[PDB]
Amino acid sequence: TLGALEFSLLYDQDNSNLQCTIIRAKGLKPMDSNGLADPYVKLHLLPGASKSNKLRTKTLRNTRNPVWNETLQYHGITEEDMQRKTLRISVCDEDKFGHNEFIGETRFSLKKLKANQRKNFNICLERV
Numbered sequence: 001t002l003g004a005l006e007f008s009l010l011y012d013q014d015n016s017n018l019q020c021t022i023i024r025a026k027g028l029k030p031m032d033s034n035g036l037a038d039p040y041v042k043l044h045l046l047p048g049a050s051k052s053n054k055l056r057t058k059t060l061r062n063t064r065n066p067v068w069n070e071t072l073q074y075h076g077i078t079e080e081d082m083q084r085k086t087l088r089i090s091v092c093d094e095d096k097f098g099h100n101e102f103i104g105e106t107r108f109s110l111k112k113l114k115a116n117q118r119k120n121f122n123i124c125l126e127r128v
Contacts, residue, residue, distance in 0.1 A: 002104040002125040003028040003064075005041075005091060009108070011082060013115035018077040018087075022057050024067040025091055025125075028103055035101050038094040039066045045074065045085045045110075059094050082110045091125060102127075 006023035022041045030037070040059040055072040087108045092100040104125025113119060 001029055002127070003091065004122060004124050005089065005106060006120075006122050007089065008118055008120045009087070009113055010118040011077070011110075011113050011115050013079070016075065016077055018074040018082075018110070019071055020055075020074070020087065020089075021071045022068045022089075024065070024069070026065050028064045028066070028091065028093075028125075030064070031093065031101050031103065032095070035093050035095050037062050037064055039063065039091055039103070040094060040100075041068065042090045042092060043072055043074075044088045044090070045081070046088055048085065082113065082115075085110045 004026045008021040010019045012019060020043055025039060028039055038059050038061050041057040043055040045053040057068045057070050060066040060068065087110055088105060090105040091103045093103060094100050104127055106123045106125060
């Protein structure tokens with residue numbers, strides 16, 4: 001009931017570069033009545049340094065069907081990272097004061113990605 005998220009991953013191994021295209025979400029669930037339908041996506045590689053392991057898309061405005069159409073790139077990602085790490089993808093709505101309400105997430109173990117082979121996803125969000 002939470003929403004569907006479309007995204008694409010490509011590990012450009014020769015350039016130590018993980019490109020995460022956050023495409024669109026469909027049907028994100030209305031939550032807080034005092035919240036805003038201003039969705040963004042947060043990426044977190046786990047486990048990880050904090051800071052350096054987080055990337056965020058643009059925040060869009062007044063939509064339950066956002067199209068970010070945005071590529072976030074983690075540089076310096078090696079085969080050791082690909083073996084050890086999980087990409088967590090969380091969709092949040094920004095509120096009136098800049099804080100946020102979590103809608104849902106998905107995770108992908110980077111082990112399962114083949115170097116240089118783009119993988120496309122259309123998943124339903126879950127709360128963990």
